[PDB]
Ligand binder design. Structure first.
Ligand SMILES: Cc1cc2nc3c(=O)[nH]c(=O)nc-3n(C[C@H](O)[C@H](O)[C@H](O)COP(=O)(O)OP(=O)(O)OC[C@H]3O[C@@H](n4cnc5c(N)ncnc54)[C@H](O)[C@@H]3O)c2cc1C
Length: 451
């Protein structure tokens, strides 16, 4: 039966709850305790579910192709609630107004020049320049052997205008990252693979030429959190119990909390990475000290069903140069059939790296900024019936070239200074829900080798 040894999982978001699920199965004889600092499980995942609404406060969905989360959802009995996103028309907002996303393009890279050059997003001259670059690529281009930033890869092939006006805001989406720092190999390795096969970027994207790509749940993403807790059979969940310190107990660890210590043999930290650095002072973790973040607010406005749709499609992304506080907005009721059946619901995002001060301001200042933006964008006065504001402090890390190797080195240092302490979550192996689930599964698995 039960071993003397104990696993403590720290953080009750998706990474920590997934970790407990997988730990229950991998180690029938190991004791499992989960410490969550706040009043609830779920971390960033939270769903507003009153008055027949199902409106996401944090992540709204996940990439279906990352099927580990689909598999978890099925295994725990939630498969029947899976819904896909509707596709219709999306837009880029810049200083020149609301432009439809150009047709004839894969990830903003033109594959049909005639259709693409109908766009108003670039000037005629910029369009001619994109065409000349695509059809007549320089012999001086070289396929990158080592990883380089996306912007360094893309700018010489496509020019600055297309990268700035279309690709960056398209590919960054609600996350708002900087195209010029993100890794090429870790984000879009198929660009390079296809270029190498087709001999040019334009013909590489043409190999890739063609119900949306995303999954959520009818009962809301928070129902996933709730079901995970429910299917745990022996893990002890302690809410309102932040981990405050880690000390050595002759090979084991003493974990300090407000209500007395927990003793552990294995510790999985799934909490924000700057708390990792502070909790593990004998570990030299500059990689984690230099991993930056920004904060995001979501501001959701519920309107009585509208005769003139405020946005004529699923939503828009905003060019960072334009005079707006919002970085993106979604017509939730257009994108998700289940969320708000008899209403018009808009969800705006606010916050970029190096520019997120609005997120720390009051609800009235945040709301007013979002309202002004939309009233200008939509042409008219808008009178929301209800507003739901959520704030995801330090929520998005900026992964740059060499991240994955830096995280390997962080993990080796932690294992060498604190044997039995493992890390998982959004700082490490990908920001998205499925990446975090995988992060949890792989770290649980690797404890399995070490017993
Ligand atoms: C604005 C925004 C939008 C996003 N949209 C998407 C999306 O559409 N699709 C997608 O796939 N991903 C999205 N993500 C990424 C997604 O949120 C992450 O994949 C996921 O929530 C990370 O979960 P986690 O458990 O690692 O961290 P968190 O959700 O941050 O959970 C950390 C937990 O640890 C707890 N904690 C903190 N300190 C302590 C302590 N000292 N002791 C104990 N517990 C502590 C916290 O209270 C929390 O419960 C989005 C992220 C943001 C910021």
């Amino acid at each position: 039966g039960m071993s003397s040894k104990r696993l403590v999982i720290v953080g009750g978001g998706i990474t920590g709850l997934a970790a407990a699920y997988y730990a229950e199965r991998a180690f029938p004889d190991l004791n499992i305790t989960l410490l969550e600092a706040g009043e609830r499980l779920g971390g960033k995942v939270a769903t507003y579910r009153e008055d027949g609404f199902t409106i996401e406060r944090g992540p709204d969905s996940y990439v279906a192709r990352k099927h580990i989360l689909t598999d978890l959802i099925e295994a725990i009995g939630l498969g029947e609630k899976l819904v896909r996103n509707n596709t219709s028309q999306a837009f880029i907002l810049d200083t020149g107004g609301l432009h439809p996303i150009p047709k004839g393009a894969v990830m903003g890279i033109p594959t049909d020049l005639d259709l693409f050059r109908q766009t108003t997003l670039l000037t005629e001259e910029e369009k001619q320049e994109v065409a000349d670059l695509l059809l007549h690529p320089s012999d001086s281009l070289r396929i990158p052997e080592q990883d380089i930033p996306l912007g360094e890869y893309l700018r010489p092939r496509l020019g600055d205008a297309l990268v700035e006006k279309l690709i960056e805001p398209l590919l960054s989406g609600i996350y708002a990252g900087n195209i010029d720092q993100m890794s090429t190999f870790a984000t879009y390795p198929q660009f390079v693979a296809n270029e190498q096969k087709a001999g040019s970027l334009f013909e590489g994207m043409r190999l890739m030429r063609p119900t949306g790509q995303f999954l959520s749940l009818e009962t809301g993403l928070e129902s996933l959190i709730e079901r995970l807790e429910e299917v745990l059979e022996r893990s002890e969940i302690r809410l309102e119990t932040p981990l405050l310190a880690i000390s050595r107990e002759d090979g084991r660890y003493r974990l300090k909390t407000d209500h007395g210590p927990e003793y552990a043999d294995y510790v999985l930290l799934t909490i924000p990475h700057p708390q990792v650095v502070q909790l593990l002072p004998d570990a030299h973790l500059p990689e984690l000290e230099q991993l930056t973040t920004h904060s995001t607010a979501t501001v959701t406005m519920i309107f009585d069903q509208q005769q003139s749709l405020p946005i004529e499609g699923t939503g828009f992304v905003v060019n960072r140069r334009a005079p707006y506080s919002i970085t993106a907005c979604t017509a939730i009721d257009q994108k998700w059939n289940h969320s708000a059946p008899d209403h018009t619901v808009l969800r705006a995002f606010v916050g970029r790296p190096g520019n997120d001060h609005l997120v720390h301001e009051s609800d009235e200042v945040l709301q007013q900024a979002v309202l002004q933006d939309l009233e200008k964008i939509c042409g008219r006065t808008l009178e929301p019936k209800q507003v739901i504001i959520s704030r995801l402090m330090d929520g998005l890390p900026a992964y740059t070239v060499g991240h994955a190797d830096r995280i390997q080195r962080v993990r080796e240092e932690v294992l060498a200074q604190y044997p039995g302490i493992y890390l998982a979550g959004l700082a490490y192996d990908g920001v998205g829900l499925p990446d975090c689930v995988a992060s949890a599964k792989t770290m649980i698995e690797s404890i399995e080798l070490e017993q």
